[PDB]
């Protein structure tokens, strides 16, 4: 009966922000709590209680939603696979590489950290071109690196004797599955400064700079369980929620517009991080009427 | 007691560096360079630890600071891979692990003005500016001792804004307060050891923010010198020497 | 078997529900966790890092010349150097800061700010400046006698080449919305102006113009709430 004590502590306790102490005036020499040296590389140690006369505030504002868990544990689109079986693509299946860097919202949040180590939850929202969800049966097979990749809707790899597969219909709640940390290294790496293989990297197209196979986690194979062309195209949307996050080496957030997945390539028309004023003195605030 | 002295002496190996106008010494991420503990090791071969031969100060490059100067960047293991007994233990072994103590030197008269930003960026992936043509050349990714002049320092040639580079371990060489920057950086990687030829752990960046201004009659040639020193260098996986 | 009754909210995919899904790999033990330096567990720890403010974001100023507040020897007295607003999530100088980009991932902020100034001039250049924080209600001060009435520091150049202006938390409400403009100027923070308390004096054979580097950050009592998406970067097609 020691779990009743554990079940009570299963709530988000509030951790409050810092308090302010009351301050008085200081008229003396040799005590300069406002002069700093930014060349040191350290941020300013100056506090409010030493620059102005402050009051006592008992701050009760919470700081929990600023954790890296809460900031990241939120689903987001990481892929859109289109299973085509109509027109000039009578395939019935798609093999999609697992890359979470194809959509700007999840990408910019992840590229805040250099190394991340997390478990994940993957939800699949599949439908047709008109938002409709008939009772078509679909198989969502996961093909780890080295496993054989399907070549038709009716090929032996769909037997999923060892690969994880999920059978679901479009007319059912979105399939959801917990994925562990699956990298040979001890953490994923959104920025790899190097090359995968040794050699003289004197090629015209240096397509291998930055590619770390520790993040290449394989393919997702999706088929309609059918025996011929269904004539209907199915869109699948992959949402990745990050759980048990550990992040290292913060980085500047992206300022330029992305151009290509897997590369930090930007454009020659460099945009400005800040918008433009008319002068270094103009501010956009027309307050009250001055008394004088 | 609670201040930072301006005189500093940095002695590792058979090298000593003196400075009389130092600001402080940045201990990146609060951690000192260390050897690989057995709890966090994967290779079974006994590592080589050349203590005084490898861990020492190497003066490697001097760049001429000018008014119209963008900046320069070096990649850390690449800058020292053809020099001394470091550039031989790193060519004979497949695995390598080391920190460093970067020291940047720029002195000028009290009638000169200007400020440099010296930062150490883990996993500094250089991007290309597209109108091949979409990927950087090997000269711009691993430039060696003679580093690479920046093309767009505003974006650090990586798409990231320069204003936020202060999130990395950094220092300033402001020509009215100091003339050297010192950054001690531990080994940062998602793997205990890694190749010193195919992977650059850190990027060393020196960018002028406030350009170098002087008056007529002053010394027009103000050089910036980069001195680096490995700390706690280990090597494993001996084989034929490879230079890539 | 056991009688149950389904309730509303069944079959819904709430993108922020901390639930439990089935594991796709039974018996999986991942790679061991080794010590990587530089672990950060809170975004507020990043907001307290000083980053460069883009105060010279005027039209025609390109590149790193936007991170520089020009300071110069003056012919007249009591003149204005530069101004900017202290709303962290407003289009302006605070877009270049880490506290200004983390703020845009949240809806409301609270706590004191910190704008550290650094004088990158000659050793022989002396001067004194009056940096003033004008609380909400008033427009940008038209004179130094008006700005003097607010939270201000006088800054003497010297050996220690940096000064810290703590923008204190003077607010009607416990929180301010990151959005600003229109009705949301109810949450305006104020205006920081830099005046010349004295002149910028230099000896002969010394440059008469220098720069000031602004470094904005957050204090120990900074907080954020109502996590949201950002208006920073856009996309029109999948990167492929």
């Amino acid at each position, epitope marked *: 009966e020691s779990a009743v004590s554990a079940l009570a502590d299963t709530t988000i306790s509030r951790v409050t922000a810092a308090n302010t102490a009351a301050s008085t005036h200081s008229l003396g020499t040799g005590r300069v709590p406002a002069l700093q040296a930014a060349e040191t590389g350290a941020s300013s140690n100056s506090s409010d209680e030493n620059l102005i006369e402050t009051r006592c505030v008992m701050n009760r504002n919470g700081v929990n939603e600023a954790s890296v868990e809460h900031f990241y544990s939120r689903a987001g689109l990481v892929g859109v696979v289109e299973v085509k079986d109509s027109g000039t693509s009578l395939d019935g299946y798609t093999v999609w590489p697992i890359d979470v860097m194809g959509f700007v919202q999840q990408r910019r949040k992840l590229e805040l950290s250099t190394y991340m180590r997390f478990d994940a939850e993957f939800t699949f929202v599949s439908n047709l071109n008109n938002s409709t969800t008939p009772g078509m049966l679909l198989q969502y097979m996961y093909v780890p690196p080295g496993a054989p990749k399907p070549d038709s809707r009716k090929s032996y790899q769909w037997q999923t004797a060892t690969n994880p597969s999920v059978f679901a219909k479009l007319s059912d709640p979105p399939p959801q599955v917990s994925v562990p940390f699956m990298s040979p290294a001890t953490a994923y790496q959104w920025f790899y400064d190097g090359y995968p293989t040794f050699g003289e990297h004197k090629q015209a197209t240096n397509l291998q700079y930055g590619q770390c196979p520790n993040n290449m986690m394989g393919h997702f194979a999706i088929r309609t369980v059918s025996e011929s062309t269904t004539g209907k195209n199915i869109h699948v949307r992959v949402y990745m929620r990050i759980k048990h996050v550990r992040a290292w080496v913060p980085r500047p957030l992206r300022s330029q517009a992305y151009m290509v997945k897997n590369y930090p390539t930007y454009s020659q028309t460099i945009t400005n991080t800040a918008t*433009d004023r*008319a002068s270094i003195t103009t501010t956009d605030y027309e307050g009250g009427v001055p008394a004088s | 007691c609670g201040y930072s002295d301006r005189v500093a002496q940095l002695t590792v190996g058979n090298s000593t560096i003196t400075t009389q106008e130092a600001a402080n010494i940045v201990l990146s991420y609060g951690e000192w360079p260390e050897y690989c503990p057995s709890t966090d090791a994967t290779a079974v071969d006994k590592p080589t630890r050349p203590d005084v031969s490898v861990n020492r100060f190497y003066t490697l490059s001097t760049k001429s600071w000018k008014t*119209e*100067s963008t900046g320069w960047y070096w990649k850390f293991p690449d800058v020292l891979n053809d020099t001394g007994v470091f550039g031989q233990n790193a060519q004979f072994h497949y695995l390598y692990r080391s920190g460093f103590c970067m020291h940047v030197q720029c002195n000028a008269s009290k009638f000169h003005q200007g400020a440099l930003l010296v930062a150490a960026i883990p996993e500094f992936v250089i991007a290309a500016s597209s109108p091949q043509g979409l990927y950087p050349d090997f000269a711009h990714t691993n430039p060696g001792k003679d580093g690479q002049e920046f093309r767009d320092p505003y974006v650090l040639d990586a798409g990231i804004p320069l204003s936020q580079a202060l999130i990395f371990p950094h220092q300033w060489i402001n020509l009215r307060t100091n003339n050297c920057a010192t950054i001690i950086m531990p080994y940062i990687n998602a793997l205990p050891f890694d190749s010193a030829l195919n992977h650059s752990n850190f990027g060393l960046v020196v960018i002028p923010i406030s350009p170098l*201004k002087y008056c*007529n009659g002053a010394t*027009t040639e103000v050089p910036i010198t980069l001195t680096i020193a490995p700390l706690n260098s280990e090597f494993s996986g001996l084989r034929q020497a490879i230079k890539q | 078997g056991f009688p149950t009754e389904l309730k509303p909210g069944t079959n819904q995919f709430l993108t922020t529900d901390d639930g439990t899904s089935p594991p796709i790999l039974p018996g999986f033990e991942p790679t061991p966790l080794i010590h990587i330096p530089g672990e950060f567990t809170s975004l507020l720890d990043l907001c307290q890092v000083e980053t460069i403010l883009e105060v010279n974001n005027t039209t*025609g100023t390109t590149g790193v010349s936007r991170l*520089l507040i*020009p300071v110069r020897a003056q012919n007249n007295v009591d003149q204005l150097c530069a101004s900017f607003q202290v709303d962290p999530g407003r289009n302006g100088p605070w877009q270049s800061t880490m506290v200004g980009q983390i703020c845009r991932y949240y809806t409301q902020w609270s706590g004191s700010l910190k704008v550290t100034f650094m004088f990158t001039g000659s050793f022989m250049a002396t001067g004194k400046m009056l940096i003033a924080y004008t609380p909400p209600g008033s427009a940008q001060p038209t004179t130094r006698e008006a700005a003097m009435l607010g939270t201000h520091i006088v800054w003497d150049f010297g050996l220690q080449s940096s000064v810290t202006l703590v923008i204190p938390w003077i607010s009607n409400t416990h929180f301010r919305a990151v959005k600003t403009g229109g009705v949301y100027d109810y949450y305006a923070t104020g205006i920081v102006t830099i005046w010349y308390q004295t002149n910028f004096v230099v000896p002969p054979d010394t440059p008469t113009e220098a720069n000031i580097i602004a470094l904005g950050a957050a204090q120990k009592n900074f907080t954020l709430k109502l996590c949201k998406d950002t208006d920073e970067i856009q996309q029109t097609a999948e990167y492929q």
Partner: antibody
Amino acid sequence: EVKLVESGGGLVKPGGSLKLSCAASGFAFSTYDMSWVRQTPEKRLEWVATISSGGSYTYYPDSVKGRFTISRDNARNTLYLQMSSLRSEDTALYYCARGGPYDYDGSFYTMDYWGQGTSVTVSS
Amino acid sequence: DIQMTQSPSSLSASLGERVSLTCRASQDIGSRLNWLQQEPDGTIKRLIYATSSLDSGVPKRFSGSRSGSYYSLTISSLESEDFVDYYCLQYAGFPWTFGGGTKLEIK
């Protein structure tokens, strides 16, 4: 005192070449961006060239881009303008002035101290 | 190219009056409009820079301002050596363009 002395004018035949130097004195020539300016006989000024304070960066308007080249000698404190195949549309008075878009501390000396004015004439 | 248009090509006055010369821009140029003065011999000197700052050594009779897209240079009290020529230079775009002269004469 800042003094710029341009020299090298003359009457060059159509489709030729001409070099226009500009002796600088009284200031640190290695810290300022310089630029050349034209003045059509119609009393209409025009930008022709600009160069960085070190000589790496150059910008030419489309009316001049491809023909003229602007050099810089900092040890001798001289500024050059090497012309190429010319036309009657280039007969004007050329001025050497300070200013350039390749300086982070610019925008203050932009066209602050002009020269005296040479005179080129393209005709037969 | 940012075409800049000076409104008066010529303005007559008498010693002591107050004249003003405007110069409008085709796009946003900010506080990057300068003013020049060409003497009869052919020397150019910069009077006002950034539309509101007078060059060190210029009389207090010159005053620059901005009212919308119109950038104006005002001569409060005209003296004798103020009847030569005036140009506006913009340096916000890359093709730095100049005005078209505002030669002031006497009556």
